[PDB]
Amino acid sequence: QPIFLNVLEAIEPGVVCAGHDNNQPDSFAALLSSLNELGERQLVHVVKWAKALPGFRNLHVDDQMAVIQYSWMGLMVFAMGWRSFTNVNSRMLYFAPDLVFNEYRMHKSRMYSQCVRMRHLSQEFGWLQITPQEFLCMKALLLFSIIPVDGLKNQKFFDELRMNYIKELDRIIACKRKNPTSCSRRFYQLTKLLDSVQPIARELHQFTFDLLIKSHMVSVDFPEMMAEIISVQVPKILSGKVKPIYFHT
């Protein structure tokens, strides 16, 4: 009352810096090494955040880390889109206060197309007039949006958790949203927005995987924790063993 939203607001991560050297000419090697470091810092925070979510400990211990790892990229993308919207009106990609991507950096990073999709996702927060509370509920739903095609250790607990988060988003749209037809229109919009995160995360995963494999050749540094997740968990996604749960299609 509103207990659920109270929680989401309480656990939302603070500012996370990349540690990028902005006082020197951009280089593909430097920019990507900084995204890798930032990526690792975010994963660390995403784990603490996820573990504090209502019902999260209902999941089996093994399912817990798997769900975090599979969902990590999408969660990062979604939160980054929001920061971009709120801080710079979606004009640039606000990865961190010390790692803001303008068009030049988007190009230099060699992930221009992926950045353009992320920029579009950020613009949608404005076009759809996403509230901070809708954003928090959607980001939590995102954690429960990608699983092994052949289920988890205890799939039932996960299914119940997902259903409960869907219900929370519902209440949130209905809180001040009059008569049904409007709630339906809004749920339709948000579910479409949520689904749109998955293809972006997939493309980012593909690029990251490719870069890791050739990392030694391009002078890109991958922290050990990243190398492990990208080589062990990410291929399960790229090979189709683990897939997103789409609302539509």
* 36 near ligand LGB (CB under 6 A): yes
* 77 near ligand LGB (CB under 6 A): yes
- Cβ burial of 96 (10 Å; 0-12, 13-18, 19+) is buried
The site that binds ligand LGB (CB under 6 A) totals a number of residues, namely 15
* 32 near ligand LGB (CB under 6 A): yes
Contact region with ligand LGB (CB under 6 A), list: 45-53, 75-83, 138-146, 164-172: 75-83
Rounded to 5 degrees, φ, ψ at 226 are -70, -50
* 76 near ligand LGB (CB under 6 A): yes
Task: Among 28, 157, 207, 247, indicate the residue that binds ligand LGB (CB under 6 A).
Answer: 207
* 95 near ligand LGB (CB under 6 A): yes
The least CB distance from residue 238 to ligand LGB, in Å, is: 13
Of the pair 140, 211, the CB lying nearest ligand LGB is at 211
- Using CA of residue 126, residue 128, residue 134, residue 135, what is the dihedral sign? negative
* 80 near ligand LGB (CB under 6 A): yes
How does strand 146-148 pair with strand 99-101? unpaired
Give 147's strand partners. Answer: 243
Is residue 99 within 8 Å of residue 34, measured between CB atoms?
A: yes
Q: What H or E segment, with its residue span, contains residue 148?
A: strand 146-148
* 42 near ligand LGB (CB under 6 A): yes
The span from the CA of 145 to the CA of 162, in Å, is: 8
Is residue 187 within 8 Å of residue 174, measured between CB atoms?
A: no
Name the binding residues.
Answer: 36, 83, 208
| Binding positions for ligand LGB, rule: CB under 6 A | 32, 35-36, 38-39, 42, 76-77, 80, 95, 204, 207-208, 211, 226
